[PDB]
Amino acid sequence: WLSNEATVARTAILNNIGADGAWVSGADSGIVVASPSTDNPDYFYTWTRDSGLVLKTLVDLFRNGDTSLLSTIENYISAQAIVQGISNPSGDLSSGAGLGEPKFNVDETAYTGSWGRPQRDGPALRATAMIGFGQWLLDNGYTSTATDIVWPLVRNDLSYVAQYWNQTGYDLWEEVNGSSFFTIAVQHRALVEGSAFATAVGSSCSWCDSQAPEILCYLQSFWTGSFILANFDSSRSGKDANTLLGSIHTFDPEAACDDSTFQPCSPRALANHKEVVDSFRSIYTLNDGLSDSEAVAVGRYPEDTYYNGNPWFLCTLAAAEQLYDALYQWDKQGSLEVTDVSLDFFKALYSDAATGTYSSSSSTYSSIVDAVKTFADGFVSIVETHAASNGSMSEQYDKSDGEQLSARDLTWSYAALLTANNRRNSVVPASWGETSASSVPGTCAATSAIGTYSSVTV
Numbered sequence: 001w002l003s004n005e006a007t008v009a010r011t012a013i014l015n016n017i018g019a020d021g022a023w024v025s026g027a028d029s030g031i032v033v034a035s036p037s038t039d040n041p042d043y044f045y046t047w048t049r050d051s052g053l054v055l056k057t058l059v060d061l062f063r064n065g066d067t068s069l070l071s072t073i074e075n076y077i078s079a080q081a082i083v084q085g086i087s088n089p090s091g092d093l094s095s096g097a098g099l100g101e102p103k104f105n106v107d108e109t110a111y112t113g114s115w116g117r118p119q120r121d122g123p124a125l126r127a128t129a130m131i132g133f134g135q136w137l138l139d140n141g142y143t144s145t146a147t148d149i150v151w152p153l154v155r156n157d158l159s160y161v162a163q164y165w166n167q168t169g170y171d172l173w174e175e176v177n178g179s180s181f182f183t184i185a186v187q188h189r190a191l192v193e194g195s196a197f198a199t200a201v202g203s204s205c206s207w208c209d210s211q212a213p214e215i216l217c218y219l220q221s222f223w224t225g226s227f228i229l230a231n232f233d234s235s236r237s238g239k240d241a242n243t244l245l246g247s248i249h250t251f252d253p254e255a256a257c258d259d260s261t262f263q264p265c266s267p268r269a270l271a272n273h274k275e276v277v278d279s280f281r282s283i284y285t286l287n288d289g290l291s292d293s294e295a296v297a298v299g300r301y302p303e304d305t306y307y308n309g310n311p312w313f314l315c316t317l318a319a320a321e322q323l324y325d326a327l328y329q330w331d332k333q334g335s336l337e338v339t340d341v342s343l344d345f346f347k348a349l350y351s352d353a354a355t356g357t358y359s360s361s362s363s364t365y366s367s368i369v370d371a372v373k374t375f376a377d378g379f380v381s382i383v384e385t386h387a388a389s390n391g392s393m394s395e396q397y398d399k400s401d402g403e404q405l406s407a408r409d410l411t412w413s414y415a416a417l418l419t420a421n422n423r424r425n426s427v428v429p430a431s432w433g434e435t436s437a438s439s440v441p442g443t444c445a446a447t448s449a450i451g452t453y454s455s456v457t458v
């Protein structure tokens with residue numbers, strides 16, 4: 001099913017991208033629409049986050065050999081030159097504040113209604129998407145495109161992150177004003193790979209270099225001692241697919257099981273995995289009768305009331321993806337570790353789990369990775385059960401009966417499927433430099449640095 005579903009996923013995404021995507025007539029060239037739904041709910045807009053996550057996926061597929069995605073990527077780049085310059089209710093380009101705008105109309109005009117703005121993850125995610133393509137351009141002799149177009153676009157977004165990271169905004173769910181794990185994690189990543197891109201184009205990013213370790217320093221605060229807190233400050237539990245998404249979208253296939261960057265196989269992210277997934281076990285009738293060793297439908301956070309509070313396709317896929325990422329890392333390392341922090345995670349899947357280090361050649365490793373693989377597959381199977389017979393995936397599936405609800409054909413659901421399927425196949429993205437960006441400063445500073453903002457014309 002995964003193979004055929006991935007086929008539908010690629011084409012479905014393109015159907016949601018302007019100008020010629022079949023489901024989104026009216027959308028400009030290179031504009032990713034979140035869903036073709038214009039009513040109940042109205043998702044016929046372009047979000048900087050959704051577009052950036054979708055484009056990262058496309059760039060990764062393109063770089064792995066899917067070369068026909070070229071014009072789609074190029075079109076996105078062109079669109080973003082325009083989008084960055086749209087004065088909007090978050091602000092303008094000159095001050096940088098405009099880059100924090102969550103969403104835009106599909107014809108590249110400001111969305112003027114009230115909204116949970118700014119959302120500071122956007123510029124980080126766009127930079128991350130663009131950098132990947134900048135890397136490819138350099139590798140294939142397109143130096144002028146990488147240096148004159150991609151870099152200046154990236155430079156605006158890196159400047160935004162360095163200047164504004166230490167300010168409150170809304171989370172990825174657009175609901176909680178504060179400071180959010182997912183946002184901080186992806187911002188840290190963006191500054192690190194952004195600095196390396198700057199060097200590669202014969203430039204520099206001094207604001208990237210000074211701010212990255214401070215963002216990482218702050219990121220440590222999200223560890224509660226048993227899971228990763230989603231937001232400061234909230235009276236929710238803080239258990240949130242937010243933190244699964246933070247881990248998988250900052251996964252570096254070169255990384256060890258680093259707690260400081262909450263890598264998928266780190267004891268912190270594994271402990272968090274169990275806490276987040278477990279929060280959905282009792283609250284959905286869809287999960288009735290399943291035991292703690294079995295996968296379940298996963299929503300956003302247990303307190304969610306959006307459409308009554310339901311499982312989400314992308315959140316269930318994130319639970320699978322972190323595990324596939326852990327499997328890849330454990331295999332690359334040639335070992336797996338059970339710690340006091342991660343013991344409960346392991347014990348639920350393998351009853352005889354005990355603290356220690358088990359070699360890939362070893363017997364214990366085999367039993368654990370087998371259980372982990374089956375568990376991860378369990379999440380994908382639930383997704384497969386609730387996708388339409390033609391492969392369509394909405395935003396949500398029903399907490400009681402698994403019927404699809406909210407926005408139909410959610411682009412981000414398709415991207416999540418493609419990434420989850422890839423990691424299951426041991427297909428991993430380019431490294432982002434985590435191996436020399438996991439050192440936490442002794443003392444954290446509430447600070448910023450100033451870059452440069454300049455309008456790009458393509």
Ligand SMILES: *[C@@H]1O[C@H](CO)[C@@H](O[C@@H]2O[C@H](CO)[C@@H](O[C@@H]3O[C@H](CO[C@H]4O[C@H](CO)[C@@H](O)[C@H](O[C@H]5O[C@H](CO)[C@@H](O)[C@H](O)[C@@H]5O)[C@@H]4O)[C@@H](O)[C@H](O[C@H]4O[C@H](CO)[C@@H](O)[C@H](O)[C@@H]4O[C@H]4O[C@H](CO)[C@@H](O)[C@H](O)[C@@H]4O[C@H]4O[C@H](CO)[C@@H](O)[C@H](O)[C@@H]4O)[C@@H]3O)[C@H](O)[C@H]2NC(C)=O)[C@H](O)[C@H]1NC(C)=O
Pocket residue numbers: 008012022023024025026036037038039040041044388390391392394404405406407408409
């Ligand atoms: C697998 O099979 C699936 C089943 O067939 C299939 O899903 C279907 O896909 C088609 C598209 O080919 C959808 O058709 C659209 O239906 C719109 C109205 O849908 C409502 O009513 C339906 C009938 O009762 C319901 O089924 C439907 O429920 C679904 O959606 C809910 C909300 O998201 C969701 O909660 C449900 O679970 C369920 O999924 C829903 O309630 C209809 O409005 C729309 O017409 C537009 O688009 C046509 C072309 O796509 C144009 O011909 C037409 O003129 C309309 O165009 C306007 O809107 C477009 C964007 O959507 C723009 O591009 C156009 O330019 C134009 O925009 C103007 O107008 C806008 C306001 O109207 C305005 O905002 C703009 O500014 C501009 O002025 C279309 O016919 C169908 O709904 C899907 N059915 C289901 C069950 O989901 C799926 O695609 C298949 N999957 C694969 C992988 O192949």
Ligand SMILES: *[C@@H]1O[C@H](CO)[C@@H](O[C@@H]2O[C@H](CO)[C@@H](O[C@@H]3O[C@H](CO)[C@@H](O)[C@H](O[C@H]4O[C@H](CO)[C@@H](O)[C@H](O)[C@@H]4O)[C@@H]3O)[C@H](O)[C@H]2NC(C)=O)[C@H](O)[C@H]1NC(C)=O
Pocket residue numbers: 165166167168178179214217218220221222223224225232444445446447
């Ligand atoms: C801008 O950057 C600064 C510097 O990084 C950053 O300051 C830090 O904020 C965090 C989060 O508020 C602080 O950590 C807190 O410390 C207080 C006081 O001791 C604790 O009560 C808090 O406990 C909560 O979180 C714990 C997990 O860390 C949970 O276990 C617990 O139950 C509570 O939920 C919390 O640890 C940190 O001390 C400061 N550091 C400094 C140097 O001030 C600031 O938040 C950033 N602001 C924005 C908007 O980005």
Ligand SMILES: *[C@H]1O[C@H](CO)[C@@H](O)[C@H](O)[C@@H]1O
Pocket residue numbers: 258434435436437438439
């Ligand atoms: C993460 O990165 C730091 C340096 O920033 C290393 O010292 C650490 O071992 C890990 O690779």
Ligand SMILES: *[C@H]1O[C@H](CO)[C@@H](O)[C@H](O)[C@@H]1O
Pocket residue numbers: 213439440441442
């Ligand atoms: C690892 O590196 C960071 C800076 O990247 C330092 O703050 C830390 O003290 C250690 O040298």
Ligand SMILES: *[C@H]1O[C@H](CO)[C@@H](O)[C@H](O)[C@@H]1O
Pocket residue numbers: 445446447448449
């Ligand atoms: C925040 O604080 C740091 C010092 O830790 C400065 O480098 C920066 O300019 C800002 O004032």
Ligand SMILES: *[C@H]1O[C@H](CO)[C@@H](O)[C@H](O)[C@@H]1O
Pocket residue numbers: 163446447448449450
């Ligand atoms: C970000 O904020 C710091 C204060 O910590 C300033 O020094 C800096 O100029 C930038 O505005």
Ligand SMILES: *[C@H]1O[C@H](CO)[C@@H](O)[C@H](O)[C@@H]1O
Pocket residue numbers: 148152453454455456457
């Ligand atoms: C800042 O940089 C941009 C992108 O290169 C230019 O278009 C602008 O004129 C300014 O120099």
Ligand SMILES: *[C@H]1O[C@H](CO)[C@@H](O)[C@H](O)[C@@H]1O
Pocket residue numbers: 081082083084085086087093454455456457
């Ligand atoms: C940079 O910003 C300017 C001013 O909004 C635009 O004219 C340009 O197209 C780019 O977006």
Ligand SMILES: *[C@H]1O[C@H](CO)[C@@H](O)[C@H](O)[C@@H]1O
Pocket residue numbers: 454455456457458
């Ligand atoms: C790119 O260059 C054009 C000039 O053609 C400017 O108008 C725009 O603001 C952007 O800097």
